[PDB]
Amino acid sequence: GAESHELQDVLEETNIPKRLYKALSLLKKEFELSKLQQRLGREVEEKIKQTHRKYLLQEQLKIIKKELGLEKDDKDAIEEKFRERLKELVVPKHVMDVVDEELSKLGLLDNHSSEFNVTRNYLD
Amino acid sequence: IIKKELGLEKDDKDAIEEKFRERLKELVVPKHVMDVVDEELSKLGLLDNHSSEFNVTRNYLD
Asked: What is d(CA B33, CA B39) in angstroms, rounded to the nearest whole number?
């Protein structure tokens, strides 16, 4: 891929050895350039894989933490809390199914949603 | 195994939980507010700092 100047220089050479060696050297320079060109992108590949792998080790220890560190708390635990809170009470049946429906909603409702907070407040 | 894995990435923590705990330590704090703050702090820790409910929860704590 040498510039036309290099090709002209090769042509000017009359001796066969001179032109052959010049052509070989030009070929290896053009290979150097092109391999730099492609190496930039392949190095991007390597960087993104490296960061993903580091995040994957972080993720392994973070899953173990989720089991232990976060304890998987609040996974519909308020439902059981209120179940026990209502356990001692001799509660009617219509309000029993109302509480069951509210619990199903709350499990379906996302914790962040203000509707979820209002549902928890009403159930309280 | 857990503690060595964490040691691989040991350094972390912003320490707001314990900050409010020590803030209330001096005061003779009623049990009602203590349990309410415990529930609020459990909701906070189980929620990411980004979530707006996290900010509202922290404001309630303050």
From this structure: 10
